[PDB]
Design a protein around this ligand. Structure first.
Ligand SMILES: CCCCCCCCCCCCCCCCCC(=O)OC[C@H](COP(=O)(O)O)OC(=O)CCCCCCCCCCCCCCCCC
Ligand SMILES: CCCCCCCCCCCCCCCCCC(=O)OC[C@H](COP(=O)(O)O)OC(=O)CCCCCCCCCCCCCCCCC
Ligand SMILES: CCCCCCCCCCCCCCCCCC(=O)OC[C@H](COP(=O)(O)O)OC(=O)CCCCCCCCCCCCCCCCC
Ligand SMILES: CCCCCCCC(=O)OC[C@H](COP(=O)(O)O[C@@H]1[C@H](O)[C@H](O)[C@@H](OP(=O)(O)O)[C@H](OP(=O)(O)O)[C@H]1O)OC(=O)CCCCCCC
Ligand SMILES: COCC(CCO[C@H]1CC[C@@]2(C)C(=CC[C@H]3[C@@H]4C[C@@H]5O[C@]6(CC[C@@H](C)CO6)[C@@H](C)[C@@H]5[C@@]4(C)CC[C@@H]32)C1)COC
Ligand SMILES: COCC(CCO[C@H]1CC[C@@]2(C)C(=CC[C@H]3[C@@H]4C[C@@H]5O[C@]6(CC[C@@H](C)CO6)[C@@H](C)[C@@H]5[C@@]4(C)CC[C@@H]32)C1)COC
Ligand code: NA
Lengths: 512, 150
């Protein structure tokens, strides 16, 4: 319960239940002793038990996750709130221990460090150290250099092109004969090329670019009574994308239908995609009608093309420099929305004053609510006029108090364009370093989720993914790498010896 | 006439090449190198603005004019007006015209709202973030430019 959904402790397995029903020893006693010390909240005992025995990094990550879960549970049930602080401190201590052990291991030997992070752990419910660190939301572990190199190797697939990637993938995905002139890692070459995560990502990217092109084409030109070929291709893309979203919902981790929905409606991109798909369905339904409903469906298509143009930042978030910028944009959006309220108050005051001064004989109409926001908002973006506002009143009669409008406009422009925007510039400027560092760490953490979600996807892009959906039904009636790494007993012993040497060296260096 | 147009295009490069002559001055060389690095930063921040501008332009063109044949002028109205809009040339009759009076197009009231959101994003968010990026990465660029010039 404390660990997670997919975790399965050794105590609840059938072998241990049979061994316990008729009542031996334990092969690794320090694992159970450290788990007991963590559950009983004895930090010194847990620290003593951590450095004895094998699998020190796995034990540290498990202890960090358990302490975080216990802190959340204690804070949920209104404890004394000092227990929660102690548990959070214990979680931080174990996480820092894991990070320092990883740093020492990578500094000593790199290949064994990468082998240490991906080999299957039989004692910890068959999960690698990367999965344990991700399940604990340990951002300083995944952002380390060794973890990033391992993620790059996992993302490149079974290829070796590291000098200049991207262009070669595009040139081999547009010219299938060009695939064979590529170096690999020690008929089947095509299968290894088209199953790499980077090739799948570029296939999806090119398909999305083509879909955006067709969506742009179908709205600019005249729309006929029945959909043309490009419109049918766009509708097929939307339908297959919706089917893929439903498949991703159904194949989630929990076994409950209503729990998979709650865990899928966590990322905002999924919710926005669902809303956009429903809106496009409504617009498509209204389009196949008489002329006014067809026009309404076309307007819905325009709103949808706005959204599908905005969704290119998700694709851009793979570049090393274009992801953190997008996250910084996401936080500066909150800051800008905080300043927008004061801007709106000043704008509304000026607009109401001007509208009431200039036009004193207006009946109650909804156009009164338009003249308040429209003109003052366009005024602060360089469209300052002098005849449209405060007109030069042969000559028309001058309204009473019509000389106050230029003074109010002067004060309003001085406040809006010299004070608030400069203060917002200062706010963006003085809170940039922390936002930049946090965005870099978060992007380097989410690289793992990107790689995994492109590793699990089918080869064919959504335009022609309906073939990959049909073949799953045929296999329905009937991970060597990418997630884990299975090794023999000799390599396991060598890894254990390497890990104990690393932890001994780390403790000796710390004492020195 | 074509050769004269080639000359008129070519004079720009010989005007720009005065910065190479300026690079002998003690204070004008490092500034040019800083410009050279801020150009890369500016392109990285210009891609996103291009995306937003294309979205707004396509939306406005599709909403206002629904009876257009496929012509290359459709590719001109997407970029032209939205790009001139963010440099202070905001108009109110050229975009969202006051539709004796001409008939009002279906959904023509969304264009001012989209323009408001687009102006708020382009002129208050991205340019201020670019100012912050130029501001917080100036000391290292200045020192590197001085060392490289020397
Ligand atoms: C609600 C969406 C309905 C879609 C159908 C109608 C669309 C018409 C209006 C377009 C609105 C689309 C904006 C949706 C983007 C939000 C995505 C998100 O929340 O992910 C958070 C995302 C991360 O969530 P995470 O998965 O938890 O990490 O953080 C970001 O990257 C935010 C950065 C993108 C937002 C800045 C760009 C917004 C420009 C909008 C200005 C409109 C210009 C039009 C001219
Ligand atoms: C003098 C007032 C006459 C009111 C009747 C005529 C009103 C027409 C002119 C409007 C003038 C209203 C400004 C009054 C605000 C001062 C309040 C104050 O001093 O509290 C200090 C207050 C604290 O005093 P404390 O009690 O000692 O803490 O400090 C503040 O919070 C000042 C922040 C608000 C000032 C910035 C906003 C001013 C915008 C004015 C621009 C006009 C736009 C029109 C378009
Ligand atoms: C590709 C050139 C074609 C020329 C014939 C057509 C010309 C028409 C377009 C004008 C393009 C001229 C730009 C060439 C400058 C690049 C020089 C270079 O790379 O040296 C790097 C140079 C150093 O390389 P290094 O020798 O390895 O140290 O670094 C710099 O100094 C870059 C600073 C100059 C660039 C900023 C000014 C650019 C303004 C262009 C805006 C157009 C305004 C038109 C109105
Ligand atoms: C739809 C557009 C989406 C593009 C963005 C969305 C997809 C996208 O992200 O593209 C970027 C992609 C990745 O970059 P790529 O791997 O090829 O090359 C990186 C680049 O050389 C950096 O400068 C390196 O950083 P550094 O300074 O040396 O340290 C980095 O080294 P490393 O440390 O990482 O090993 C290199 O990896 O390739 C392109 O650059 C141009 C593709 C052109 C495709 C555009 C034409 C379709
Ligand atoms: C004057 O008469 C012209 C006529 C030939 C007309 O052919 C037309 C064929 C479609 C085509 C090429 C034309 C105009 C808009 C063009 C769009 C602009 C879009 O822009 C892009 C812009 C950027 C992309 C990201 C999005 O889409 C295109 C998908 C889109 C685009 C290139 C689709 C193609 C359209 C011309 C002459 O022949 C006798
Ligand atoms: C074209 O003919 C229209 C006619 C119906 C006319 O009804 C009128 C009733 C008053 C009403 C709803 C109307 C226009 C201005 C409206 C004001 C705008 C103000 O804005 C707000 C703006 C924001 C607030 C903070 C301040 O006040 C309102 C207090 C204010 C407000 C909503 C009060 C309500 C006013 C329409 C059709 O029926 C046959
Ligand atoms: Na201006």
């Amino acid at each position: 319960y404390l660990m997670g959904g997919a975790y399965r402790c050794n105590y609840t397995r059938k072998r241990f239940r049979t061994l316990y029903h008729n009542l031996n020893h334990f092969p690794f006693p320090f694992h159970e002793l450290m788990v007991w010390a963590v559950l009983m909240k004895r930090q010194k005992m847990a620290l003593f038990f951590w450095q004895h025995g094998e699998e020190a990094m796995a034990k540290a990550l498990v202890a960090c996750k358990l302490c975080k879960a216990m802190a959340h549970e204690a804070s949920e049930n209104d404890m004394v709130d000092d227990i929660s602080q102690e548990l959070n401190h214990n979680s931080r201590d174990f996480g820092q221990l894991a990070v320092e052990l990883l740093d020492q291991s990578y500094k000593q030997d790199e290949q064994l460090a990468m082998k240490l992070l991906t080999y299957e752990l039989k004692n910890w419910s068959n999960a690698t150290c990367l999965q344990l660190a991700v399940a604990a939301k340990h951002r300083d572990f995944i952002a380390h250099t060794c973890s990033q190199m391992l993620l790059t190797d996992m993302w490149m697939g079974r290829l070796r092109m590291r000098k200049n990637s991207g262009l070669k993938v595009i040139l081999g995905i547009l010219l299938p004969p060009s695939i064979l002139s590529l170096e690999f890692k020690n008929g089947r070459k095509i299968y290894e090329f088209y199953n790499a995560p980077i090739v799948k990502f570029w296939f999806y990217t090119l398909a999305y670019i083509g879909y955006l092109m067709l969506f742009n084409y179908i709205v600019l030109v005249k729309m006929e009574r029945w959909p043309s070929t490009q419109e049918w291709i766009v509708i097929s893309y939307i339908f297959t994308l919706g089917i893929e979203k439903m498949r991703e919902i159904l194949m989630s981790e929990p076994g409950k239908l209503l729990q998979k929905v709650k865990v899928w409606l966590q990322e905002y991109w999924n919710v926005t995609d669902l809303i956009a798909i429903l809106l496009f369905s409504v617009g498509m339904i209204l389009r196949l009608q008489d002329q006014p409903f067809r026009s309404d469906g076309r307007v819905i298509y325009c709103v949808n093309i706005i959204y599908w143009y905005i969704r290119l930042l998700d694709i851009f978030g793979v570049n090393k420099y274009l992801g953190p910028y997008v996250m910084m944009i996401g936080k500066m959006m909150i800051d800008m929305m905080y300043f927008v309220i004061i801007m709106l108050v000043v704008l509304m005051s000026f607009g109401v004053a001007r509208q009431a001064i200039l036009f004193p004989n207006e009946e109650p109409s909804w156009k009164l609510a338009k003249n308040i926001f429209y003109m003052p908002y366009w005024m602060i973006y360089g469209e300052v006029f002098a005849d449209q506002i405060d007109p030069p009143c042969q000559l028309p009669p001058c309204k009473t108090g019509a000389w106050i409008v230029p003074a109010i406009m002067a004060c309003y422009l001085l406040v809006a364009n010299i004070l608030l925007v400069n203060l917002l510039i200062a706010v963006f400027n003085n809170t940039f370093f922390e936002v930049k560092s946090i965005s870099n760490q978060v992007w380097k953490f989410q690289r793992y989720q990107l790689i995994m979600t492109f590793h699990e996807r089918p080869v064919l892009p959504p335009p022609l993914i309906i073939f990959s959906h049909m073949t799953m039904i045929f296999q329905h009636v009937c991970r060597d790498y990418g997630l884990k790494l299975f090794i023999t007993d000799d390599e396991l012993k060598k890894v254990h010896d390497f890990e104990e040497q690393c932890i001994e060296e780390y403790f000796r260096e710390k004492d020195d």
